C-alpha cells in the first residue's frame, strides 16, 4: 500500500504545516501537524477542557463506530519549546492520503497548553519519530508509520515541504519526479528515539564550505534551524546590523537586509537554503526588526534541522531494519 497527502503552511511564515487526516467511522477529518520529532498522535477532542479549545476541529469518539477506549491508558507529553498536552486514549481507524491503519492509538487531549489553544489551525499532532518515544502508559503505543510499515510497498515516508506553498507527505514510495539529481543517504542513530544524523558541515552564502560534524535531528515539527552558536554567529555576521537579542529571544536582523543562503552537508552532497527561507518577518507588527530563521541550539541540548532546513530538500525517512535519512535537492 501507499498514501499521499498534501501538507499546507498554517500561515504566511510557514510557522508549521497541517495535513488532513481521517479518523473514525464515518470519517472525522482533522488537520494534524506531522511531527518527525515526536511519537504521539494526539487530537483536540470532545474531552478537551472547553476553555482550552479555540476554533479547532475536535474528534468525538462517541460518534465513531470503530472507536474503542484503550482502558487505563493515559498520555502526557512536553515538547522542547515548553508546549504540552495530556489525556486518555482510544483506538480507531486512521487514514492519511488513502493509507489506512486500523487499531491506531488516537490520544484524546483533556488538557493542552496555551500555545496549542492559540493555534486554531492545528487540530493535533501526528508523531513520526520512533515508537520508543511514545508517551502512552502503561502500554506504550506505536506510531501511524510503525503500524503501517509492514503493509507499505517500501518501509519509508517522505517529507517535501514547501516554501510559502503546499507540499507533500508520501508513505510507502519515493516519488522520483519530486526531486532533482540523486538522493544522498546518511546514517541514523535511533538511540534517543529521533531521526538523529550527522551533517558534514556548512557554508554561509558564497563562502567556503567548513567541514565539521554537526549531530542533530530531522524535526518537521520545529519551525526553525537550530545549530551550534559558532555556526549561527558565523551566519549572522554576514548580515549588517544583525544581533542576538536577549529580550526578543534570538537573532534579529534589519528587515531591509538581503539574507545570504546557508548550505548544509549531507555526506559529500550539499543542500542550499535560500536566504529568503531564513526570514521570519517583523518581530511585532510594523517593526523593522525581523526574526531570524537560523538560531542557536545552545541550551536546547541538541541541534535541530527543522522546517527551515527540511523545506529546502526532498527528505526520505527510511524505516528499514537499519533506518537511514535521505536528502535531495528539488
Ligand atoms: C507551539 C505549539 N506547536 C504547534 C505549532 C508545537 C508543534 C510541534 C512541536 C515540536 O517540538 N515538535 N517536534 C512543539 C510545539
Going from the Cα of 44 to the center of ligand 1, the distance in angstroms, rounded, reads 14
d(Cα 302, Cα 136) in Å, to the nearest integer? 24
Tell me how far apart the alpha carbons of residues 144 and 160 are, in angstroms, rounded to a whole number.
18
Yes or no: say if 36 and 161 are a contact pair by the CB < 8 Å rule: no
Q: What phi-psi label fits residue 133: left (phi over 0), alpha (psi between -120 and 50 degrees) or beta?
A: alpha
- C-alpha cell belonging to residue 5: 497527502
CA of 199 to the centre of ligand 1 (A): 23
Ligand 1: residue whose CA is nearest its atom 9: 221
Q: What is the DSSP string of 107-143?
A: EEEEEE-HHHHT-TT--EEEE-S-GGG---BSS----
How far is residue 45 from each of residues 37, 86, 224, measured CA to CA in Å?
22, 12, 28
Q: Calculate the dihedral angle through the C-alpha atoms of 98, 102, 103, 105, rounding to the nearest 10 degrees.
A: 0
CA distances from 39 to 153, 185, 230, 257, 284 (A): 22, 23, 31, 38, 33
Atom of ligand 1 nearest to the CA of 116: 2
Q: Ligand 1 pocket, 83 CB below 6 A?
A: yes
- Which set of grid coordinates corresponds to residue 228? 551550534
**Helix/strand number for the chain, H first, E second:** 4, 24
State the catalytic residue, choosing from 95, 199, 296, 297: 199
83 CA from centroid of ligand 1 (Å): 7
Report which of 164, 168, 194, 192 is spatially closest to residue 179, judged by C-alpha positions: 168
Extended beta strands in 151-277, E state: 156-160, 167-171, 184-187, 196-204, 210-218, 225-227, 243-245, 250-254, 262-266, 269-273
**Has 35 been annotated as catalytic?**
yes
- Elucidation method: X-ray
Q: Which atom of ligand 1 is nearest to the CA of 10?
A: 5
Contact between 16 and 79 (Cβ < 8 Å)? no
Integer Cα distance of 66 and 126 in angstroms: 19
Contacts of 329 (CB under 8 A, 6+ apart): 179, 180, 181, 271, 272, 312, 313, 314
User: Where do the H-state alpha helices sit in the chain?
Assistant: 114-117, 144-148, 229-236, 307-310
Q: Do domains 5-174 and 175-330 have the same CATH topology?
A: yes
Here the cell at position 291 is 526574526
User: What's the gap in Å between 302 CA and the centre of ligand 1?
Assistant: 16
User: Which residue's CA is the nearest one to ligand 1's atom 7?
Assistant: 221
- How far is ligand 1, taken at its centre, from the CA of residue 31, in Å? 14
Query: 303 to each of 78, 176, 195, 199, 220, how far by Cα in Å?
Result: 18, 29, 12, 10, 13
Residue 4 phi/psi, 5° resolution? -150, 125
The sheet with strand 196-204 has its strands ordered as 269-273, 262-266, 196-204, 210-218, 303-305, 225-227, 294-296
CATH code for the part of the protein at 5-174: 2.40.70.10
Q: Are 124 and 32 in contact (CB under 8 A)?
A: yes
The atom of ligand 1 lying closest to the CA of 38 is: 13
Question: What ranges do the domains of the chain cover?
Answer: 5-174, 175-330
Q: Catalytic residue at 199?
A: yes
Rounded Cα gap, residues 221 and 177, in angstroms: 25
Q: Per this entry, what is the length of the chain?
A: 330
Residues 203, 271: Cα–Cα separation, whole Å: 10
User: What architecture (CATH level 2) is domain 175-330?
Assistant: Beta Barrel (2.40)
Lookup: cell for 220: 518537521
Edge-to-edge, what's the strand order for the sheet holding 250-254?
A: 243-245, 250-254, 289-292, 279-282
- Kindly state if the Cβ of 37 falls inside 6 Å of ligand 1: yes
* Distances from the Cα of 20 to the Cα of 71, 139, 149, 314, angstroms: 27, 27, 20, 20
Query: Nearest-CA neighbor of 307 among 9, 59, 56, 48?
Result: 9
Cell 519519530, residue located:
129
CA distances from 55 to 75, 121, 231, 304 (A): 23, 8, 40, 30
Amino acid at each position: 500500500s501507499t498514501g499521499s497527502a498534501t501538507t499546507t503552511p498554517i500561515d504566511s511564515l510557514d510557522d508549521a504545516y497541517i495535513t488532513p487526516v481521517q479518523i473514525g467511522t464515518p470519517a472525522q477529518t482533522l488537520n494534524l501537524d506531522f511531527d518527525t520529532g515526536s511519537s504521539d498522535l494526539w487530537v483536540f477532542s470532545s474531552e478537551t477542557t472547553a476553555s482550552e479549545v479555540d476554533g479547532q476541529t475536535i474528534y468525538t469518539p462517541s460518534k465513531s463506530t470503530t472507536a474503542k477506549l484503550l482502558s487505563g491508558a493515559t498520555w502526557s507529553i512536553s515538547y522542547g519549546d515548553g508546549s504540552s498536552s495530556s489525556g486518555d486514549v482510544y483506538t480507531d481507524t486512521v487514514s492519511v492520503g488513502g493509507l489506512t491503519v486500523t487499531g491506531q492509538a488516537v490520544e484524546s487531549a483533556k488538557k493542552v497548553s496555551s500555545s496549542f489553544t492559540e493555534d486554531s489551525t492545528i487540530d493535533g499532532l501526528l508523531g513520526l519519530a520512533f515508537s520508543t518515544l511514545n508517551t502512552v502508559s502503561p502500554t506504550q503505543q506505536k506510531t501511524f508509520f510503525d503500524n503501517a510499515k509492514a503493509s507499505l510497498d517500501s518501509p519509508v515516508f517522505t517529507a517535501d515541504l514547501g516554501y510559502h506553498a503546499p507540499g507533500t507527505y508520501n508513505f510507502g514510495f519515493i516519488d522520483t519526479t519530486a526531486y532533482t539529481g540523486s538522493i544522498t543517504y546518511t546514517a541514523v542513530s535511533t538511540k534517543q528515539g529521533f531521526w538523529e544524523w550527522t551533517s558534514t558541515g556548512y557554508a554561509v552564502g558564497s563562502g567556503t564550505f567548513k567541514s565539521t560534524s554537526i549531530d542533530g535531528i530531522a524535526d518537521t515539527g520545529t519551525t526553525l534551524l537550530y545549530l551550534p552558536a559558532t555556526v549561527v554567529s558565523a551566519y549572522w555576521a554576514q548580515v549588517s546590523g544583525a544581533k542576538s537579542s536577549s529580550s526578543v529571544g534570538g537573532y534579529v536582523f534589519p528587515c531591509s537586509a538581503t539574507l545570504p543562503s546557508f548550505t548544509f552537508g549531507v555526506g559529500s552532497a550539499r543542500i542550499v537554503i535560500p536566504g529568503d527561507y531564513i526570514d521570519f518577518g517583523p518581530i511585532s507588527t510594523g517593526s523593522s526588526s525581523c526574526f531570524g530563521g537560523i538560531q542557536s541550539s545552545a541550551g536546547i541540548g541538541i541541534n535541530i534541522f527543522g522546517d527551515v532546513a527540511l523545506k529546502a530538500a526532498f527528505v526520505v525517512f527510511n524505516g528499514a531494519t537499519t533506518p537511514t535519512l535521505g536528502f535531495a535537492s528539488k
